[PDB]
Amino acid sequence: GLDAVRKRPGMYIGDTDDGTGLHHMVFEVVDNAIDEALAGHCKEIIVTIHADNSVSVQDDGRGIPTGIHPEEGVSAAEVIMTVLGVGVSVVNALSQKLELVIQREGKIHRQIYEHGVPQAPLAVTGETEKTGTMVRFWPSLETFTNVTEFEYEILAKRLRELSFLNSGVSIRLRDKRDGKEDHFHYE
């Protein structure tokens, strides 16, 4: 399943060699935050281009479900991230690393994956007065070629579009490599 996506990344994510696929990975993650906004629960999304070749998407919604199936021992979060608008489990499969942090019901929950494989169970890392979901991922360098770094203007252009197609949601884009910041929101 996650092996199929790794074998033929182009089918799922788009071209792996000119940066189209690389940027679609961001948009896949954002679409879920936008859905949480369409359901009324998320007011703001923050997309950050980090200086270590990762992007993070943070929403202020209800947070991804964190409960465990008792007999299976697997959290809803882990199901969401590992099982097959191509979906976030594809992003996970094509990331050398992905970090999920969930603020929900007063607790911070966290899980790390490498190439889609979880490294430990979902775990509580603190308390919080907020809710939301944060996904931060480092794209796989076995998968992506030529364009292996995120490009501000490709995300800016698309995140503006999404801002105006889903009127009311605030989308912020931040680039840690040069301090560039933008704010997209339409009345």
Ligand SMILES: CCNC(=O)Nc1cc(Nc2ccc(OC)cc2)c(C(=O)Nc2cccnc2)cn1
């Ligand atoms: C940075 C990316 N943001 C993000 O993933 N936000 C998000 C996603 C949520 N659910 C979800 C729904 C569908 C999905 O795959 C298409 C993956 C996750 C949910 C969600 O369904 N939360 C929820 C709803 C009802 C009860 N308990 C938790 C909330 N926020």
